[PDB]
Structures are given as structure tokens and as C-alpha cells.
């Protein structure tokens, strides 16, 4: 295993902060937020 | 067996397409309407007839190549890839005449293992590769430094991601049943006088024994996963001159022999992996009877006795073991009838990690591959693709194939149905076993194809299918009927 | 038993002569393979087809039938312009690199290459001249990973045991579309036992007196055990075929009007059919099965007695691996053992045989060739093989005991038996009461027809089968388009 690992905890940032150096980015930094915000409203187990 | 074999049946044929203007060619088809099986006679003739034109309509064929016409296979390489020491045009067109040649890889860098057979399309309803779609030998500059252990590698252009992400699972199993039964009656009667005398018996034994073991052990290991890149994709050069070839107009059978040859969905991320399933399935019974009996008069005299003693045993027993992925050496060994020991079970995983099976994938399908930088005319070649890729599915969907026997498994190859047969029963319809019956899984028959528009409908029956013959298991997969907008 | 069916062969006698085609310089005719033997009777002394010497009726045609592009004049090959001086060798004449730079031949040629391009008799079994060119590239520097490259070495001036870089890539032909190296088995293992016996008896007593005793004891055992091990799987190509040399003329020297004779030479030169797809693998399969019994019977009364006892014992017994070294496929076929799989599965890595595949009649490879459509010829192909899988086909071998294999070797039959002397009456050993299958009798002819009726026929075997033997598929009539 010190060989070949695996990730075995982890602490986590949003996706939609790393959002850099591409047209309207500002934007896509809120817009991926909200899609992330409606992913979960998705995705969120309270649905079953 | 209880046979009248089904010979191959095309439809009668499409009218024409009119000529293609670029093509300079006009099609037709037909449906395959009854696929070969009980080996009735094949009727394939590669499913499409072709003819040449005499039209004259325009084309606009000519999507520009901005960099350097590879002259053999028609691809178009960008300038910077010309005498980079590599072959990027296929036939090495490309580092002709290089007045001077410059190198990028600082040492020897193997493909990841693997990496050119994830490159192939699959016919996601037969579950296989068909041909390659992806230049997973192309290369872009590349030379990234890879390690896996201690050995280095060299990542295909069209990859985003092969990394070890190194799993495993073992799960095992292990069951005992055992039930016994003994019941023992008996009777006496007697009588005597001074002369006359009398006497009866009987003795009895009825008993029953069972057991059933099952163990069951499957290990996973997961020791590379792939991701394909999501667009920007380098084509196969072979896959890229059957889709030049697609006409613009719409006429099924020149589409079908594109997922025929490269496949119906693009492989775009995968779990690369090992499987080791051994299953071990046991049943066991035994029954006795023994009876006994007398009856005597005595007055001149006479005896009756009777014995009657019977006994019976038997096993039945099933083993079945996969692997997928490893050396050949170890895959025999693993293959063997016994539980491996786990020197075995080392030496083969060090091997999957040289040469893995796909595990778990998720697919694209291929017209997101067809593009306006590869292709004239490109989105009419994508709407017709995406029609032909759903008349396809209709096609190389088992459903057509009549039920096996034995709960066999058809999957439906080129244009014959096959009975895939389980441990226990064997012959064309997987009819001939020892056994009295076995558990039949379900599946329906070919949906309707749909209803009207402002609302539309699909619908599916079993009848022969169906579990409840002989006690089978689960009917379903998905909705026994289903319906959708018109748009 | 029954008496044998013994009889000489015949061929038939011969058609009239073809005229003298240029180019070819030859005449041709035919023999209709009337009879060839039964399993017993001496050969024919003559064969099926015939050429002789004879100069031509006019001036043969230039190379200017292959059109726009070069064509090695000694042989076949038409060619792409940019093969000429590719520095590969393109053609059987060589004269693609005559009077002028891939490395690509750095790489040896799949394994399987040549089995998958040579053509195959459905009729025997066997293969025939290859079909596909198995060595022809187009240009192509197409390599594939081998993903059983693994092997030890060990290294007495540095002390690494490892793994050698030797056979990690092969080239891949032109004619194979895809070849795929993915490492797979599967194994299905039975085991069924069953075991009875029974005991009885009854007396009476007077004053006579009689008593009886009866006993059976029995077993059966079956096993089945297959497995298929795969190093790769392949498809070949489906249109631009380049096709080998030899089939390249064998078929240019065709007719384009319908003779029999030089359309039935090139299918049992190129095959019945040839391979689509296939497999690349080691099968080995074992099956092994027993019956026994045991019984007696005893009877006294008053006084006299009598006894008697009866028993059995009988083994079948398989082991069959193919693919594999000699030296282990012989520890293999001899021992079932964690021993002898584990050295056949590296022998595997060296030897692999192609152990499962899908197939096309022969006439279908000339409509995706690069030579463009052939449909009288095609057609004439087609309608000679019509024939040929009724008077080339083991069909005609007829009987054959103890479930033997029927196979026509070149204008003679055998009945290879699984034990004893081939032909009539392969058992000596076994009992009258011994099980085996009925099996085809062949086609006939294509009957006399009506607008909407035509038939040809068949029989599920000529006897019934032996004992408690099994059956045919079930067939006895199918239709054609008059
Ligand atoms: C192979 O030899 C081994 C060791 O003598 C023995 O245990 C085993 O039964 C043999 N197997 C077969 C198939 O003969
Ligand atoms: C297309 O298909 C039908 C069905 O056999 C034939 O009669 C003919 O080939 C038609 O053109
Ligand atoms: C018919 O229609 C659906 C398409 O959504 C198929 O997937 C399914 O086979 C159903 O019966
Ligand atoms: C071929 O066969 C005829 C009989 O058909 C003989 O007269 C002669 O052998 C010819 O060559
Ligand atoms: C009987 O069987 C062969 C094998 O399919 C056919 O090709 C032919 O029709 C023959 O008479
Ligand atoms: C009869 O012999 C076997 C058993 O069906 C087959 O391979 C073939 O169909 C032939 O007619
Ligand atoms: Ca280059
Ligand atoms: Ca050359």
C-alpha cells in the first residue's frame, strides 16, 4: 500500500471555487454554485 | 429434442434513397425480422445492397485540413506534430522528408496496458468491443512522465485519466442446511389356550436426511481506472473513413455497418479491473424405509415374515469460476476446480495489474464523436446517425430470440441467436440434463414500437417467457410499460 | 452387428473441355465427385479437376486491368501508388520495391495472424490456402499491446529476477480490423452422484415351507469440466479486403460464364467459408463418467436352493486441451492437476490456438474487397458452392459405429471411431445393447419446382439409433425461391 495508495479520508472545498482563467469565470463561478445548489436539490437523499 | 430449427429472415428490401451529392452512391436495406438459431440457416449477406450515380446536385465536401494531409488515411495532423519522432499520420506519413528530426520522450514509456483495446467502440446490447474509434497510439507531444509501481508510461492524447485508484473486495459466502427425521412403530398381539395359541408383529423404520452446503466467494480488484477526455477527440483513421462514407441522406444500412465495425457508444470512463468468482453449490439427500413383519397360528401350525429395506443417496453439485484480467499462467491455476491459495490469488493480481477487463463503464453514444473539425455536412451525418442508432438498438436487442431451455442466455451475435448454457444442462437449446426442472429468470418480449404523437406508449408481455413454469425467479428489470411527450 | 457397405469409388465420367483463356494457357474440365467411397473399397486412381497446356484464341490483356495504378506484372497484386518503394514488400513479385522506409516489421505478426486468414471447410473441418493476405499491411504501422507479455528472467551480474521486455508488441495484419489482447477464463464444473439399494424377502412356514430374498445395490457418477481461457479476441475487416495472392489469381482465372469446374476448385482450394471473428485461447475440457450395479437372488423351499449375483463397472473418461505447449499438453491430457494447469496456462503464452470464431460463405469476401463488384462471377461462386455443400459434404460418409465422426479426406470417406478399427463395426468390446445418436443423412438435390414451390429434403438418420440414443436437430424439408 505505500506502493500503490488510495485517498482514505478526505476534507473538502466546492468545485465551484477552483472556476479560473476562462471566459465569463466570475459568472461561472456563481452559476456553477447554483447549479451545484440544484444538483443537490437533486441529488439530496430527502427525496426518497 | 423437441426442435424445428428458425432459418434467417431479411425484410423485402427499402425503396431507394435518391443519390447522395458527395457519396455519389444510393442505398437500401432491410430489417433483420427473425435472427438464425437452432443452427437454421444463415441469411446475412451482410445486410445492405449499394449502387453507383449519374446526379449532379452540389456537394461541399471539403472541410478544410489546416495542417498536413496524412496521404494514406486521410486524417490531418496539426503542424507541430510533423518530424516530432512519432507517428501521428497512421502509415508515418507525417516524418517524411524531415530535414531535421526532434525527439520528446526522454526514455523508453509503455502504453498503459490495455489503453488500445479501451480505444474500441462497444455494441453496448451484445456487451463487446467491435473495432477501434480513438488513435489511442497518437500522442499530441505527450511525454508526461507516468509511474505505476516503478514502470513508466506513455498516456494516449484522447485519455484524460488511467491511474491505479487501487480497490479491492473480497466477499465470501458460506451456508449449511441439514434436517433429519427417524420415526419407528411398532405393534404385538398374542393368544393361548390348553390346544391353540396365536402371535403377531410388526416393526418399522421410516427415515430422511438432507443438507445442502454453499459458499460462495467473489473478489473484485480495481487497480486502474480510465477516463476518455470529453470532446477534442483524435479518430481511429479506419472509423473516420466509414463516417466520410455515411451518406447525407437517410437510408439505415450504410449507418448500421458503422456500429457493426466500431460500435453503438463511445467508452468514456471505466473501472479496470480483476474479477476472481468462484461459486460452490452443493445439494445432498438421503432416505431409508424398513418394515418388518410376522403372523403365527399354532393349533398344526404356520408362520408368515416379511422384510422390506431400501435406501438411497445423492449429491448434486455445481462450481463456476471467473477471471477476468491477469497471465495466463495464473489464470489456469486460478481457473483450477479448488479454492485458491493465496500465493495464487497474489501472482494473479500482480498480472491484472499488466492486463485488466473492464469491471464498470459508462458509455457516450458515437454520433458526439462525429464533428464539424472532422466532418462536411456534420449534423445531418449526427441526426441520421442518432436515427440509425435507435433502429439499430431495436435490432441488436436480444428480444427477437425465442427462449432458451435450462434457463439458458441468449446474446445474439452478428445475426444469430445463441443459447449461452448454464453448468448442469448442454445442446443447441441448452434442453439435455439429468436434472427434473430448473428456475427460469424473465425477460419480455420486443416493445411496440410507439403509439400516436400528443402523448405515446410502449408496451411488453412474457407469455412464454415468463418465471412461473417450473417455479422461476424474478420477472422484471425495468417498467412493464412506459410513455412519454411527443416533444 | 451389421454387415458392411464396403464399395469402390467412382468419379464420373468427364465433361467436355474449356476453352483456351489467355493469360491462364490452360484448359480445364471436370469430374463430379459421383461417389467417393464408403468406409470401405478401394480409391479412385483419377481426381475431380484437370489442367492441361494450350496456346490461346487471342492476345492476353495488359495490366491496364487493374487501371489508374500499379500492378506487379509476374503476379496478382493490384496496388495503392504509395506502396511502390514503401520500403515493404507489397507483393509476391517484389517488383513494389524494384528500381526505387517503415520499420513496422520491428514487431513479429499477431498470434493467430495466419490461422484467421486461411479459409475453412465446414464440410471437414480443416482449413484451406489463405484467404485473407495474413502478412499484407497497406502501409499501415498498426501495432497491438500483448497483454500476456510477462515472463521471467534472472540476471547473475546485477540480481534481479524480472520480467522480460520480449514479445510486448506485435503487428497487426491490414485484413484484422481489430485484435485486442484482454486476459479472460472461465470454468463450469458438475458434479452428479447417486447411490440406492434395496433388500426384501418373504417366507412361510406349515405344518411345506418357502422362503425368497432379493438385493440391489447401484451407483452413478457424472462430471463435466470445461474452461476457456482467452489472450486476446479479433475481427477481421469487412470491406477493402486485401485478398492473399494466391486467391488473387486463383480467382481472376475464374469464368465469367457458369462452369462448375473452376468455381468448385476455388472453393476447396480457399474453403467453404472464411473466418470473420474469432478468439484466441486455451480450451481444456475433462468429462468423466461412471455407472456401476450389483444384484442377486435367493430362493429355498421344501428341498432345494439356488443362487445367483450380477454386477457391472464402466468408465468413460476425456481430457483434451487445445492450445498449449507439446510437452505440457501431454502433462495436461495425462493428469488433471493444480500441477498440470498452472504450466499448460504458461505454455499458453508462447502457444495459443484459436479456440472460438464466426464465419461468412466464401463469395461474400469478393464484395468487400477493393477490386469493386464481381456479381457474375459472385454469383457463379455461389452457384457452384450450392452444389459443392451437397457432393463435397461428410453427409455422404454415411455409417459410422459408436458415435464415430464422419469426415471426407480428399475423394475418400473415414468413420474415426473413439475406439477400435474405423468403419463397420468399431466395437468388439461393448455389448449389442450400447447407445448411440442418430445423425444426418444429407440433402438432396433441388426437386422439380412450381411458381410458388421448390423443396430439397432430408432424413434425421437412415436407421433409428442405437439403444436409447439420441436424435437430429429435426429437419425434413426446406424451400427455395421457384
Ligand atoms: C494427478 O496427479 C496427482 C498427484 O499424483 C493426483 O493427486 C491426481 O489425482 C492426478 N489427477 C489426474 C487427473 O490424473
Ligand atoms: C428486395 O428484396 C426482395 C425480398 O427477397 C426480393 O424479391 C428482391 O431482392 C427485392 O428487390
Ligand atoms: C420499448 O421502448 C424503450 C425505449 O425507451 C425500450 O428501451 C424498451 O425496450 C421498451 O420495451
Ligand atoms: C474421361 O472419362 C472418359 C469417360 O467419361 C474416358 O473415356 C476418358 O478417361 C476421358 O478422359
Ligand atoms: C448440405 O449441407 C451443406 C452444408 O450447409 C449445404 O451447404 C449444402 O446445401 C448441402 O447440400
Ligand atoms: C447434421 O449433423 C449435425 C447434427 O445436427 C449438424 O452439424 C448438421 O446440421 C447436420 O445436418
Ligand atoms: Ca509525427
Ligand atoms: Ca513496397
Given at each position: 500500500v505505500t506502493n500503490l495508495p488510495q485517498v482514505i479520508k478526505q476534507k473538502l472545498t466546492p468545485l465551484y471555487e477552483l472556476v479560473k482563467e476562462v471566459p465569463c469565470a466570475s459568472v461561472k463561478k456563481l452559476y456553477l454554485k447554483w447549479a451545484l445548489e440544484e444538483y443537490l436539490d437533486e441529488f439530496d437523499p430527502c427525496h426518497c | 429434442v423437441t426442435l424445428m430449427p428458425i432459418?434467417?429472415?431479411?425484410?423485402?428490401?427499402?425503396?431507394?434513397t435518391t443519390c447522395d451529392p458527395c457519396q455519389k452512391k444510393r442505398?437500401?436495406?432491410?430489417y433483420l425480422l427473425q435472427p438464425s438459431q437452432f443452427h437454421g440457416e444463415p441469411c446475412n449477406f451482410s445486410d445492405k445492397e449499394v449502387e453507383d450515380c449519374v446526379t449532379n446536385r452540389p456537394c461541399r465536401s471539403q472541410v478544410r485540413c489546416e495542417g498536413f494531409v496524412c496521404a494514406q488515411?486521410?486524417?490531418?495532423?496539426?503542424?507541430?506534430?510533423?518530424?516530432?519522432?512519432?507517428?501521428?499520420?497512421?502509415?508515418?506519413?507525417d516524418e517524411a522528408n524531415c530535414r531535421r528530426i526532434y525527439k520528446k520522450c526522454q526514455h523508453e514509456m509503455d502504453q498503459y496496458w490495455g489503453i488500445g483495446s479501451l480505444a474500441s467502440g462497444i455494441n453496448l446490447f451484445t456487451n463487446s468491443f467491435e473495432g477501434p474509434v480513438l488513435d489511442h497510439r497518437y500522442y499530441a507531444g505527450g511525454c508526461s512522465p507516468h509511474y505505476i509501481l516503478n514502470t513508466r508510461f506513455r498516456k494516449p492524447y484522447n485519455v484524460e485519466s488511467y491511474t491505479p485508484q487501487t480497490q479491492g473486495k473480497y466477499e465470501f459466502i458460506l451456508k449449511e442446511y441439514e434436517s433429519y427425521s427417524d420415526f419407528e412403530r411398532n405393534v404385538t398381539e398374542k393368544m393361548a389356550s390348553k390346544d391353540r395359541g396365536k402371535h403377531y408383529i410388526r416393526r418399522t423404520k421410516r427415515f430422511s436426511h438432507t443438507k445442502s452446503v454453499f459458499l460462495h466467494a467473489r473478489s473484485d480488484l480495481e487497480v486502474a481506472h480510465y477516463k476518455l477526455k470529453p470532446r477534442s477527440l483524435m479518430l481511429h483513421y479506419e472509423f473516420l473513413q466509414r463516417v466520410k462514407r455515411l451518406p447525407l441522406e437517410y437510408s439505415y444500412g450504410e449507418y448500421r455497418d458503422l456500429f457493426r465495425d466500431f460500435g453503438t457508444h463511445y467508452i468514456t470512463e471505466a473501472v479496470l479491473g480483476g474479477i476472481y468468482e468462484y461459486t460452490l453449490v452443493m445439494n445432498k439427500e438421503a432416505m431409508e424405509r424398513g418394515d418388518y413383519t410376522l403372523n403365527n397360528v399354532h393349533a398344526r401350525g404356520i408362520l408368515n415374515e416379511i422384510k422390506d429395506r431400501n435406501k438411497r443417496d445423492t449429491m448434486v453439485e455445481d462450481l463456476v469460476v471467473l477471471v477476468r484480467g491477469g497471465a495466463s499462467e495464473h489464470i489456469t491455476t486460478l481457473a483450477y476446480q479448488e479454492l485458491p491459495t493465496a500465493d495464487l490469488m497474489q501472482e494473479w493480481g500482480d498480472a491484472v495489474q499488466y492486463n485488466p477487463a473492464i469491471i464498470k463503464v459508462k458509455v457516450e453514444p458515437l454520433y458526439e464523436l462525429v464533428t464539424a473539425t472532422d466532418?462536411?455536412?456534420?449534423?445531418?451525418?449526427?441526426?441520421?446517425?442518432?436515427?440509425?442508432?435507435?433502429?439499430?438498438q431495436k435490432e441488436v436487442s436480444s428480444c427477437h430470440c425465442a427462449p432458451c431451455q435450462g434457463n439458458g442466455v441468449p446474446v445474439l451475435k452478428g445475426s444469430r441467436c445463441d443459447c449461452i448454457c448454464p453448468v448442469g444442462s448442454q445442446g443447441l437449446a441448452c434442453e439435455v440434463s439429468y436434472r427434473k426442472n430448473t428456475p427460469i429468470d424473465g425477460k419480455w418480449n420486443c416493445w411496440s414500437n410507439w403509439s400516436s404523437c400528443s402523448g405515446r406508449r410502449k408496451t411488453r408481455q412474457r407469455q412464454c417467457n415468463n418465471p412461473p413454469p417450473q417455479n422461476g425467479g424474478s420477472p422484471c428489470s425495468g417498467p412493464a410499460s412506459e410513455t412519454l411527450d411527443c416533444s | 452387428?451389421?454387415?458392411?457397405?464396403?464399395?469402390?469409388?467412382?468419379?464420373?465420367?468427364?465433361?467436355?473441355?474449356?476453352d483456351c483463356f489467355p493469360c491462364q494457357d490452360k484448359k480445364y474440365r471436370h469430374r463430379s465427385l459421383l461417389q467417393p467411397n464408403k468406409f470401405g473399397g478401394t480409391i479412385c486412381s483419377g481426381d475431380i479437376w484437370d489442367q492441361a497446356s494450350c496456346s490461346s484464341s487471342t492476345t492476353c490483356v495488359r495490366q491496364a486491368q487493374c487501371g489508374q495504378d500499379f500492378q506487379c506484372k509476374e503476379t496478382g497484386r493490384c496496388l495503392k501508388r504509395h506502396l511502390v518503394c514503401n520500403g515493404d514488400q507489397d507483393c509476391l513479385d517484389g517488383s513494389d520495391e524494384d528500381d526505387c522506409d517503415e520499420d513496422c516489421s520491428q514487431y513479429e505478426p499477431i498470434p493467430g495472424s495466419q490461422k484467421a486468414a486461411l479459409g475453412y471447410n465446414i464440410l471437414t473441418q480443416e482449413d484451406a490456402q489463405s484467404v485473407y493476405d495474413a502478412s499484407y499491411y497497406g502501409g499501415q504501422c498498426e501495432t497491438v499491446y500483448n497483454g500476456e507479455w510477462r515472463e521471467l528472467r534472472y540476471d547473475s551480474t546485477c540480481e534481479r529476477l524480472y520480467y522480460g521486455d520480449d514479445e510486448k508488441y506485435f503487428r497487426k495484419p491490414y485484413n484484422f480490423l481489430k485484435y485486442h489482447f484482454e486476459?479472460?477464463?472461465?470454468?463450469?464444473?458438475?458434479?452428479?452422484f447417486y447411490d440406492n439399494a434395496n433388500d426384501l424377502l418373504s417366507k412361510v412356514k406349515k405344518d411345506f415351507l418357502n422362503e425368497l430374498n432379493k438385493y440391489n445395490e447401484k451407483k452413478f457418477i457424472f462430471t463435466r469440466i470445461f474452461t476457456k481461457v482467452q489472450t486476446a479476441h479479433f475481427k477481421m475487416r469487412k470491406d477493402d479486403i486485401m485478398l492473399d495472392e494466391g486467391m488473387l489469381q486463383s480467382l481472376m482465372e475464374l469464368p465469367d460464364q457458369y462452369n462448375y469446374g473452376m468455381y468448385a476448385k476455388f472453393i476447396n482450394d480457399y474453403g467453404t467459408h472464411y473466418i470473420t471473428s474469432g478468439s484466441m485461447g486455451g480450451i481444456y475440457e475433462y468429462i468423466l463418467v461412471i455407472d456401476k450395479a450389483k444384484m442377486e437372488s435367493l430362493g429355498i423351499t421344501s428341498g432345494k436352493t439356488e443362487r445367483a449375483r450380477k454386477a457391472m463397472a464402466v468408465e468413460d473418461?476425456?481430457?483434451?486441451?487445445?492450445?498449449?505447449?507439446?510437452?505440457?499438453?501431454?502433462?495436461?491430457?495425462?493428469?488433471?492437476s493444480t500441477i498440470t494447469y498452472r504450466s499448460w496456462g504458461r505454455s499458453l503464452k508462447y502457444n495459443p490456438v484459436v479456440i472460438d470464431f464466426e464465419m461468412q460463405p466464401i463469395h461474400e469476401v469478393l464484395r468487400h474487397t477493393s477490386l469493386g463488384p464481381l456479381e457474375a462471377k459472385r454469383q457463379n461462386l455461389r452457384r457452384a458452392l450450392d452444389q459443392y455443400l451437397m457432393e463435397f459434404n461428410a453427409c455422404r460418409c454415411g455409417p459410422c459405429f459408436n458415435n464415430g465422426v464422419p469426415i471426407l479426406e480428399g475423394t475418400s470417406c473415414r468413420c474415426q471411431c473413439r475406439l477400435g478399427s474405423l468403419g463397420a463395426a468399431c466395437e468388439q468390446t461393448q455389448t449389442e445393447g450400447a447407445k448411440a445418436d442418430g445423425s444426418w443423412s444429407c440433402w438432396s438435390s433441388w426437386s422439380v419446382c412450381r411458381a410458388g414451390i421448390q423443396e430439397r429434403r432430408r432424413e434425421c438418420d437412415n436407421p433409428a439409433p442405437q439403444n436409447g440414443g439420441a436424435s437430429c436437430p429435426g429437419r425434413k424439408v426446406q424451400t427455395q425461391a421457384c
Amino acid at each position: 500500500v505505500t506502493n500503490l495508495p488510495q485517498v482514505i479520508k478526505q476534507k473538502l472545498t466546492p468545485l465551484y471555487e477552483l472556476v479560473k482563467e476562462v471566459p465569463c469565470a466570475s459568472v461561472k463561478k456563481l452559476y456553477l454554485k447554483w447549479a451545484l445548489e440544484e444538483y443537490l436539490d437533486e441529488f439530496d437523499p430527502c427525496h426518497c | 429434442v423437441t426442435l424445428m430449427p428458425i432459418d434467417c429472415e431479411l425484410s423485402s428490401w427499402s425503396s431507394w434513397t435518391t443519390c447522395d451529392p458527395c457519396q455519389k452512391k444510393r442505398y437500401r436495406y432491410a430489417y433483420l425480422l427473425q435472427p438464425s438459431q437452432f443452427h437454421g440457416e444463415p441469411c446475412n449477406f451482410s445486410d445492405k445492397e449499394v449502387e453507383d450515380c449519374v446526379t449532379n446536385r452540389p456537394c461541399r465536401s471539403q472541410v478544410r485540413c489546416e495542417g498536413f494531409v496524412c496521404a494514406q488515411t486521410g486524417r490531418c495532423v496539426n503542424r507541430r506534430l510533423l518530424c516530432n519522432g512519432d507517428n501521428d499520420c497512421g502509415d508515418q506519413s507525417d516524418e517524411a522528408n524531415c530535414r531535421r528530426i526532434y525527439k520528446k520522450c526522454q526514455h523508453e514509456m509503455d502504453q498503459y496496458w490495455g489503453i488500445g483495446s479501451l480505444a474500441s467502440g462497444i455494441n453496448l446490447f451484445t456487451n463487446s468491443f467491435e473495432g477501434p474509434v480513438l488513435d489511442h497510439r497518437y500522442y499530441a507531444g505527450g511525454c508526461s512522465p507516468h509511474y505505476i509501481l516503478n514502470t513508466r508510461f506513455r498516456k494516449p492524447y484522447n485519455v484524460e485519466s488511467y491511474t491505479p485508484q487501487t480497490q479491492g473486495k473480497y466477499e465470501f459466502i458460506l451456508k449449511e442446511y441439514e434436517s433429519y427425521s427417524d420415526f419407528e412403530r411398532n405393534v404385538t398381539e398374542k393368544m393361548a389356550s390348553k390346544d391353540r395359541g396365536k402371535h403377531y408383529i410388526r416393526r418399522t423404520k421410516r427415515f430422511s436426511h438432507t443438507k445442502s452446503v454453499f459458499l460462495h466467494a467473489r473478489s473484485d480488484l480495481e487497480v486502474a481506472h480510465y477516463k476518455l477526455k470529453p470532446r477534442s477527440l483524435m479518430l481511429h483513421y479506419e472509423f473516420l473513413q466509414r463516417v466520410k462514407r455515411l451518406p447525407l441522406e437517410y437510408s439505415y444500412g450504410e449507418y448500421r455497418d458503422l456500429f457493426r465495425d466500431f460500435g453503438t457508444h463511445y467508452i468514456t470512463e471505466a473501472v479496470l479491473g480483476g474479477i476472481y468468482e468462484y461459486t460452490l453449490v452443493m445439494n445432498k439427500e438421503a432416505m431409508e424405509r424398513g418394515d418388518y413383519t410376522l403372523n403365527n397360528v399354532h393349533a398344526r401350525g404356520i408362520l408368515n415374515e416379511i422384510k422390506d429395506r431400501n435406501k438411497r443417496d445423492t449429491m448434486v453439485e455445481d462450481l463456476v469460476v471467473l477471471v477476468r484480467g491477469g497471465a495466463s499462467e495464473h489464470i489456469t491455476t486460478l481457473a483450477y476446480q479448488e479454492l485458491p491459495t493465496a500465493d495464487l490469488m497474489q501472482e494473479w493480481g500482480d498480472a491484472v495489474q499488466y492486463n485488466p477487463a473492464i469491471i464498470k463503464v459508462k458509455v457516450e453514444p458515437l454520433y458526439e464523436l462525429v464533428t464539424a473539425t472532422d466532418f462536411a455536412y456534420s449534423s445531418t451525418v449526427r441526426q441520421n446517425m442518432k436515427q440509425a442508432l435507435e433502429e439499430f438498438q431495436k435490432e441488436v436487442s436480444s428480444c427477437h430470440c425465442a427462449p432458451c431451455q435450462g434457463n439458458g442466455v441468449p446474446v445474439l451475435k452478428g445475426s444469430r441467436c445463441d443459447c449461452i448454457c448454464p453448468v448442469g444442462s448442454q445442446g443447441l437449446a441448452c434442453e439435455v440434463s439429468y436434472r427434473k426442472n430448473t428456475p427460469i429468470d424473465g425477460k419480455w418480449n420486443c416493445w411496440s414500437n410507439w403509439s400516436s404523437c400528443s402523448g405515446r406508449r410502449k408496451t411488453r408481455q412474457r407469455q412464454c417467457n415468463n418465471p412461473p413454469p417450473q417455479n422461476g425467479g424474478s420477472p422484471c428489470s425495468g417498467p412493464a410499460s412506459e410513455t412519454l411527450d411527443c416533444s | 452387428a451389421a454387415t458392411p457397405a464396403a464399395v469402390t469409388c467412382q468419379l464420373s465420367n468427364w465433361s467436355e473441355w474449356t476453352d483456351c483463356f489467355p493469360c491462364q494457357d490452360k484448359k480445364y474440365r471436370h469430374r463430379s465427385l459421383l461417389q467417393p467411397n464408403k468406409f470401405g473399397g478401394t480409391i479412385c486412381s483419377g481426381d475431380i479437376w484437370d489442367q492441361a497446356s494450350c496456346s490461346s484464341s487471342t492476345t492476353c490483356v495488359r495490366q491496364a486491368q487493374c487501371g489508374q495504378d500499379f500492378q506487379c506484372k509476374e503476379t496478382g497484386r493490384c496496388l495503392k501508388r504509395h506502396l511502390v518503394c514503401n520500403g515493404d514488400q507489397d507483393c509476391l513479385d517484389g517488383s513494389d520495391e524494384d528500381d526505387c522506409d517503415e520499420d513496422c516489421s520491428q514487431y513479429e505478426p499477431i498470434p493467430g495472424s495466419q490461422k484467421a486468414a486461411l479459409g475453412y471447410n465446414i464440410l471437414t473441418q480443416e482449413d484451406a490456402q489463405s484467404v485473407y493476405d495474413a502478412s499484407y499491411y497497406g502501409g499501415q504501422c498498426e501495432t497491438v499491446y500483448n497483454g500476456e507479455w510477462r515472463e521471467l528472467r534472472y540476471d547473475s551480474t546485477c540480481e534481479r529476477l524480472y520480467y522480460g521486455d520480449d514479445e510486448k508488441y506485435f503487428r497487426k495484419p491490414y485484413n484484422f480490423l481489430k485484435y485486442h489482447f484482454e486476459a479472460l477464463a472461465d470454468t463450469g464444473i458438475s458434479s452428479e452422484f447417486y447411490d440406492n439399494a434395496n433388500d426384501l424377502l418373504s417366507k412361510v412356514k406349515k405344518d411345506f415351507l418357502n422362503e425368497l430374498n432379493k438385493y440391489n445395490e447401484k451407483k452413478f457418477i457424472f462430471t463435466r469440466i470445461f474452461t476457456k481461457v482467452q489472450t486476446a479476441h479479433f475481427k477481421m475487416r469487412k470491406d477493402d479486403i486485401m485478398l492473399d495472392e494466391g486467391m488473387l489469381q486463383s480467382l481472376m482465372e475464374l469464368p465469367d460464364q457458369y462452369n462448375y469446374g473452376m468455381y468448385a476448385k476455388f472453393i476447396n482450394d480457399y474453403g467453404t467459408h472464411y473466418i470473420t471473428s474469432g478468439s484466441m485461447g486455451g480450451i481444456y475440457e475433462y468429462i468423466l463418467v461412471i455407472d456401476k450395479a450389483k444384484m442377486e437372488s435367493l430362493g429355498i423351499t421344501s428341498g432345494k436352493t439356488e443362487r445367483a449375483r450380477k454386477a457391472m463397472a464402466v468408465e468413460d473418461i476425456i481430457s483434451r486441451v487445445r492450445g498449449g505447449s507439446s510437452g505440457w499438453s501431454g502433462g495436461l491430457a495425462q493428469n488433471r492437476s493444480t500441477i498440470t494447469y498452472r504450466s499448460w496456462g504458461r505454455s499458453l503464452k508462447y502457444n495459443p490456438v484459436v479456440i472460438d470464431f464466426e464465419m461468412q460463405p466464401i463469395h461474400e469476401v469478393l464484395r468487400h474487397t477493393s477490386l469493386g463488384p464481381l456479381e457474375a462471377k459472385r454469383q457463379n461462386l455461389r452457384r457452384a458452392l450450392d452444389q459443392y455443400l451437397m457432393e463435397f459434404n461428410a453427409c455422404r460418409c454415411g455409417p459410422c459405429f459408436n458415435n464415430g465422426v464422419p469426415i471426407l479426406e480428399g475423394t475418400s470417406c473415414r468413420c474415426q471411431c473413439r475406439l477400435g478399427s474405423l468403419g463397420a463395426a468399431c466395437e468388439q468390446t461393448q455389448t449389442e445393447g450400447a447407445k448411440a445418436d442418430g445423425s444426418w443423412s444429407c440433402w438432396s438435390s433441388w426437386s422439380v419446382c412450381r411458381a410458388g414451390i421448390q423443396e430439397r429434403r432430408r432424413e434425421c438418420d437412415n436407421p433409428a439409433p442405437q439403444n436409447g440414443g439420441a436424435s437430429c436437430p429435426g429437419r425434413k424439408v426446406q424451400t427455395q425461391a421457384c
